[PDB]
Amino acid sequence: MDINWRHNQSTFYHFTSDHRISGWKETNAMYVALNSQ
Amino acid sequence: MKAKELREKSVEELNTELLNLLREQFNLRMQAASGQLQQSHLLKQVRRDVARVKTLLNEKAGA
Amino acid sequence: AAKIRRDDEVIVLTGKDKGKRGKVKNVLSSGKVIVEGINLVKKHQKPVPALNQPGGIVEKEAAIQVSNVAIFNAATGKADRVGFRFEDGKKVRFFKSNSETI
Amino acid sequence: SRVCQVTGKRPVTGNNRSHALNATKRRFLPNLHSHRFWVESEKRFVTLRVSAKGMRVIDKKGIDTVLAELRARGEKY
Amino acid sequence: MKRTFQPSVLKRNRSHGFRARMATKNGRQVLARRRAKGRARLTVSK
Amino acid sequence: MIREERLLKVLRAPHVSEKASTAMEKSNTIVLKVAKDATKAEIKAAVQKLFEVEVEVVNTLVVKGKVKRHGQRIGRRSDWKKAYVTLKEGQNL
RNA sequence: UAAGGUGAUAUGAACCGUUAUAACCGGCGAUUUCCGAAUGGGGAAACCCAGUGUGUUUCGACACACUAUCAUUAACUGAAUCCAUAGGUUAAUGAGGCGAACCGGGGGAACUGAAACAUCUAAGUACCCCGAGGAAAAGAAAUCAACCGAGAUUCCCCCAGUAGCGGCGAGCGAACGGGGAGCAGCCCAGAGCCUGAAUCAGUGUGUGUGUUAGUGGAAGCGUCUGGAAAGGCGCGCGAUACAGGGUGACAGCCCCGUACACAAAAAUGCACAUGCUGUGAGCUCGAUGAGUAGGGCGGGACACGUGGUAUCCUGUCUGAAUAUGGGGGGACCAUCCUCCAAGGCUAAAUACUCCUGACUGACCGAUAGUGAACCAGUACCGUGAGGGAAAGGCGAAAAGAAC
RNA sequence: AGGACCGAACCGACUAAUGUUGAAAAAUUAGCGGAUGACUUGUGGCUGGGGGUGAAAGGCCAAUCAAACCGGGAGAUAGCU
RNA sequence: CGAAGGUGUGCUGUGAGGCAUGCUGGAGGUAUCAGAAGUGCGAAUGCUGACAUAAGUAACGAUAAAGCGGGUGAAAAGCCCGCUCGCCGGAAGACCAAGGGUUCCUGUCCAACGUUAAUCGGGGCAGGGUGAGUCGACCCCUAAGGCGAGGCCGAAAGGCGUAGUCGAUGGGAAACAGGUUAAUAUUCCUGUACUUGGUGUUACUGCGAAGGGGGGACGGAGAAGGCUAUGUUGGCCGGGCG
RNA sequence: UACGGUGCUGAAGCAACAAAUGCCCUGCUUCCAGGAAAAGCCUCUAAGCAUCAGGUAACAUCAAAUCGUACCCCAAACCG
């Protein structure tokens, strides 16, 4: 359980996805930034 | 029994070789694994005794 | 070699049995000895449903250290240290203090 | 590989320097040509990959002495 | 959805197996580092 | 022929179970654990010459070892080989 | 060596042994499946499939041995072609692969610094590759010095952050000379005289010493607290031994040891001596390293970035003199001094620690010290290269809790 | 006959709603396009990092792509927090 | 006759601090004066472990659906048996390949795992279980492609490649019906078969290749024709007359 | 009948019609986009061997080794 918890905390450490906050969290930040311009 | 095996001929260590394997070794594996054979040390002493006969047989034959 | 050995009579120097004599039952390669009637522990063991079931509190002897015993002289009647001399190619033990071969 | 079989000339390395002195790596190559040498003592043509000064040293030392050197150092011709 | 690891034993071995690490200079250096690090399984064989 | 030194090392134990038992008491076959590298000619010859019976045919499977564990320490057992030795009409053992 | 043993978790069962053929320790042997350079062919490592020969008193099937490639040498064969070479077959010898650092060589960055950046730096570093040894490399002046002299190479302390080099920026940075460690010189290019003359190398033997098992090894009791004494108190003894560890709390005298004195059937390392084989001393005379030195062009190494730049190395084109000669002495010339290139060998001082032993620490003590005190390069993660944990402590003794 | 027509398997992904600490690190449901072809699919193979491949989007190259991943130079450098 | 540590109290110094002592603890501590520092943490979206908070809150993973009786049990919505009800039925059935690797079957246990309970389980523990001349692999042959003696090439490592040698996803010999185990079956058993090699005898006889020829040997679409699997209906047979 | 089943016995076992995307069919027709290889298999001989060896046919006899075989496999067992 401890090994699975360390690896499953280590899941989104090297991500790329920009529309999702922290790799996973859905948001509207594309529209927020885009409307700020 | 180490000098005793050392003082025979090659033919006679082949005889007691085949009798260590034949009479002793096989009948004690069959007797051991079929619930019989209270005396388990016989397996060990037979096995080492075949090691002695093959040792002296290699030493007697040639080098 | 070993100073205290198997069929030998010793006295106990330290603890719970200080001054009690007794014969060495066996001698364990931990550097301990079991000496009869000496280090009595009150084990209590379970009556296993296999071969015979004693149950109860069995009073065994425990292993004391080899350094906690010394062999009993019986010519002086006290504890005595052991040395090793050679006599006729035999490495014999001997009592110190009267120098007697055991 | 580009080794003269007589003189043993490997390609060496160096720099293209420019007017601004920018160092760049380059290789200097030997003038290796594959020439076919008549040996009179054996009555044969032995073809070698010589430099263009392996031919100078063959013209001076003679082809027999050179082949004795290649056979001496285990260079197979 | 079709994930990346679609297993095949024959491609596992032809690709990353021992006879294929030993087949070249750099795979032998791989095995040398796995032995030197001291590793229970060197390649992936079985 | 097969040498007798080889031919003694092949048979290893009689196999006791209920499939083995019904094979004996119903279809003449004795089931026995053999050497892992023992071929069917070796098992046939070794039952011909070590229990002095007449063997009709041998069928050999290989049984795979089970991954057990002690405490939190795993381990595979060990593969063995099992020979279904079909005897002829005249047999005892 | 031995009275106890059959490795651990891990108890049992079945036994072996007690004065010597239990067990344990060491020397030398024997066996040493399969994979792996893997080597008979193949292959998805630990598997599949052979060929050849020898033998097998049921030789309708078994057992054993050999069969890889390459290099070198030899034998027998052998084209286009006559001779012959290429090639082919067989045999003998050697190699191949792994390994932590040190060493030599072939290649060789960039981030960075220059408060940007391109010359420069980083740096001939990282890394890749080849090769070798217990060390390697270098080495016996075509070297300095300076009108006096020194005398091979290597390493250390100065010289000296000096002279110099330097977008004369950032930076790079000597030598001469001095003090030490260590010290060793030789051979071929070549004939005669003369022989085994020193020399080493390979081996036998003998001696000495060391390694691989070991042996002996001093000297204490009473009483109080206490679960227990090695502690307190009192009185003794050892010490070439009060290094250390254990023992129920803190032991010189309880145990193992320590100081000290001894021990090897066998295998070995080193050093002398000696037998044989190979090898050559020494004398006279002669020779005394040519596509080489030097040059032109391009590049590199020298602290030295082409600059007034000596010197070394060479990719390319050339090209001498050869002891009435030639190289160097920091452009260059003359005078003077010094040395003999274009062949080679050479110990010691030196560098390093995969590995073994002993000892030591104003090093750590379980979030520290190794990633790893514990079955850790494990679990686990990743296709893979690779990444990579956490987790010690009952008690003096399991007496580990019968009922 | 047909890069023919309608339409299942099969390949795809146009719209909407849900979902958005999901049942799911891209789906479900209802409709939707192709559906004998420049189709689709299984098994094996080949191409590799300034390189591949690209009916071209800077797309894709192991949930990573205006230059992959791992290890190293490496404690890069950081007049900034 | 009780150290360090832990936890209280009392006294004391301007402060960091010091001193004494009760209880826990159970074996170490160290004056003074010097010496050396991994020498003092509340912050670094610090690192590691522990524990809160929201909070007994959202959720408990397809809206295919359950109801009752009986059994076992300490306990039954969930397990077993029965009767009903619903769902899939070109699949939510059956058989494999790939992949996994004992999950299979039986007995036994309910700690943890199972988003609840569990007597149940793909969970724990033990035992059992996989039978081949004909199925598949190995094997013979090859495609793409790999490797490659020599060889050509390349600073080195190495690139390419001839002979060759490997490489299926392709070509190549042969078994079917019935029965059986809790668990295997074209493998076991019953019946009836077939294939390829070795050896021996007998009769006839020209055999012989990393060589020649054939064959293997192979496209898309379409169209019918002849069949069969299979199904439907009648006949037959057994049973029912509700 | 350890109610789980276990043995024994066992009638008819036909015809018509419909009918595949399976088989004849690796066929047939057609079309351009023109559709693997090598072995087994059958044949021909060369070098050689030639009253031998080998080939063919019948019969008999021996052999056919080794490894896989459970179980899931559109899934609670594979990749997620």
Q: How do beta strands C82-87 and F11-14 pair? A: unpaired
Axis crossing angle, helix B10-19 with helix B41-60, rounded to the nearest 10: 160
Those chains having 3 or more beta-carbon pairs within 8 angstroms of chain E are none
D26 strand I contact, CB < 7 Å: no
> How many domains would you assign to chain B?
1
If you count them, how many residues does chain A have? 37
Identify the residue among B19, B21, B27, B28 best suited for mutation to test binding to F, counting F beta carbons within 10 A and taking the highest.
B21
Tell me how far apart the alpha carbons of residues F8 and B26 are, in angstroms, rounded to a whole number: 7
∠ Cα F57 F60 F65 (to 5°): 160
CA distance D27 to E27: 30
Closest by alpha carbon to C73, among C26, C10, C5? Answer: C10
| Any F CB within 8 A of B26 CB | yes
F3, closest residue in chain B (CA to CA): B18
Query: F5 CB near a chain B CB, below 8 Å?
Result: yes
State whether F4 and B18 contact (CB < 8 Å).
yes
A neighbour chains, 3+ CB pairs within 8 Å: none
Q: Please tell me the number of Cα atoms within 13 Å of C24 on its side-chain side.
A: 23
Name the experiment that determined this structure. Answer: cryo-EM
C25 touches C35 (CB < 8 A) = yes
- Whether C24 contacts C34, CB under 8 Å: yes
In sequence order, the 6+-apart residues with CB closer than 8 A to the CB of F50 are B26, F7, F8, F11
Q: CB-based contact (8 Å) between B23 and chain F?
A: no
CB-based touch B/F (3+ pairs, under 8 A): yes
Integer distance in angstroms from CA D57 to C1' G338?
35
Q: How far is the CA of C1 from the C1' of G207 (A)?
A: 36
Q: How far is the CA of F2 from the C1' of G193 (A)?
A: 80
- Compute CA C18 distance to the chain's CA centroid, rounded to the nearest angstrom: 13
Tell me the one-letter amino acid at C64: I
Half-sphere exposure of D46 (CA within 13 A, CB side): 19
Q: Is B22 close to F8, i.e. CB distance below 8 A?
A: yes
What's the reported resolution, in angstroms, to a tenth?
A: 3.4
Pick from B21, B33, B34: which is nearest to F8 by CB?
A: B21
Q: Does F4 touch chain B (CB under 8 A)?
A: yes
E10 touches strand H (CB under 7 A): yes
Are F55 and F46 in contact by the 8 Å Cβ rule? The answer is: no
* Distance (Å) from the alpha carbon of B33 to chain F's nearest alpha carbon: 6
Closest nucleotide (CA of F60 to C1')?
I131
For domain E1-46, give the CATH number.
Answer: 1.10.287.3980
Residue in F with minimal Cα distance to B26: F8
Q: Which bases of chain J come closer than 7 Å to a protein CB?
A: 63-69, 78-80
F31 backbone dihedrals φ, ψ, rounded to 5°: -105, 130
What are F5's two structure tokens? Answer: 């030194």
- Shortest distance, CA F13 to any CA of chain B (angstroms): 6
Q: Tell me the residue range of the domain where B47 lies.
A: 2-61
Q: Does residue D67 sit in helix, strand or coil?
A: helix
Contacts of A23 (CB under 8 A, 6+ apart): A12, A15, A16, A17
The single residue listed with the structure tokens 């250096």 is: E29
C40-44 and C57-61: which strand pairing? antiparallel
Phi and psi (nearest 5°) for F37?
A: -95, 25
Rounded CA-CA distance E21/E29 in Å is 9
Contacts of F1 (CB under 8 A, 6+ apart): F45
Secondary structure element (H or E) that encloses residue E15, with its range: helix E9-16
Please indicate if any CB of chain B lies within 8 Å of the CB of F61: no
The 3-state DSSP class for residue C76 equals coil
